[PDB]
């Protein structure tokens, strides 16, 4: 599909250094729109994109009430998981949670999501049916039963199909000039000899939004999958992203190589070559 909303929660214990810290951020695609940190002076949910500022006091109070309760709730959960795993009170641990909804180009719900991890490894996840759970081990099963008893899955299904899609669509309209605008990448190829017999061709993509992009090198039209070095897509700081793909080629053979770029902001897919 084309759009999604996601909330990311991180709860971290720090024995001997105060109570566990809770941080929450909200994103619509690759655009962050809200934040909350329990370590702030006057913890409150703050705006992170201009289009959210127009929301009323009730919106901000409701978010803050929820996030302040989350801070308490997660302190209790970190205590609970420590016990489910028979761990010492001396170690630091982290519970992460990520949930939200995906919309297709038609605007209707493609699928819902809800997953949690403990120390960076899967713990419990709502299944695609939005009705059952997948617990990773006997400890997660304890959490599963509590949730089944509280009819959590039913409330999650209702949120994901109701409120989540409704707010997402509201945000996509209010922030349409940016959220619904794909900025194509500016591309170019550089050359750096690596020896008297080989050189590096690096294909650049700059200033694009959203982050989703495909950069590939071909030699005689054949994809150089195992021979292409790809860097992780990185943020520029102005909402856009950067990325590059490099291949080391024999000197005098650079014209046999073509870089192909696909991005949704592009009228049609690009093919580039080094221009001496």
């Amino acid at each position: 599909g084309s759009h999604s909303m996601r909330y990311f929660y991180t709860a971290m214990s720090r024995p001997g250094r105060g109570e566990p810290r809770f941080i929450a951020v909200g994103y619509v695609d690759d655009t962050q729109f809200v934040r909350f940190d329990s370590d702030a002076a006057s913890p409150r949910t703050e705006p992170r994109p201009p289009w959210i500022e127009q929301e009323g006091p009730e919106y901000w109070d409701r978010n803050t009430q929820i996030f302040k309760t989350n801070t308490q709730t997660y302190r209790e959960s970190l205590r609970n998981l420590r016990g489910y795993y028979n761990q010492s009170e001396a170690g630091s641990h982290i519970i992460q949670r990520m949930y939200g909804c995906d919309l297709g180009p038609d605007g209707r719900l493609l699928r819902g999501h809800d997953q949690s991890a403990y120390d960076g490894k899967d713990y419990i996840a709502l299944n695609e049916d939005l009705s059952s759970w997948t617990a990773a081990d006997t400890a997660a099963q304890i959490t599963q039963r509590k949730w089944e008893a509280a009819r959590v899955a039913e409330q999650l299904r209702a949120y994901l199909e109701g409120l989540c899609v409704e707010w997402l669509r509201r945000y996509l309209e209010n922030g349409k000039e940016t959220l619904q605008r794909a900025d194509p990448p500016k591309t170019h190829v550089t050359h750096h000899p690596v020896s008297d017999h080989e050189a590096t061709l690096r294909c650049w993509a700059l200033g694009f939004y959203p982050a989703e992009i495909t950069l590939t090198w071909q030699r005689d039209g054949e994809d150089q999958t195992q021979d292409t070095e790809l860097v992780e897509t990185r943020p520029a700081g102005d909402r856009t992203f950067q990325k590059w793909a490099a291949v080391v080629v024999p000197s005098g053979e650079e014209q046999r190589y073509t870089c192909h770029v696909q991005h949704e902001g592009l009228p049609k897919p690009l093919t580039l070559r080094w221009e001496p």
Binding site: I94, E232, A236, Q242
Partner: protein
Amino acid sequence: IQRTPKIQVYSRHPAENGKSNFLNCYVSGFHPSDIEVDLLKNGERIEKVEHSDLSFSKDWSFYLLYYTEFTPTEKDEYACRVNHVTLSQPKIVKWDRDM
């Protein structure tokens, strides 16, 4: 497990000597979340550096962007200093113009 941070040092806009810009240090793929990042101008820590709010990828590893306003020159050297539990000594990544 614990995962070491991947580090990228680069500028927001193409580097132009004498032209103002933004020095970026992107740390990603790490776990747990505590991490220390500093931007250095000729070996010394720049002060008013800011950073993004903590978030993570589908694989649960965290990522943060540290950045500061700056003006490149052919003389000045810039770098990113990173310390994390997985690291025995802080790692210094120098800013390369073609990276």
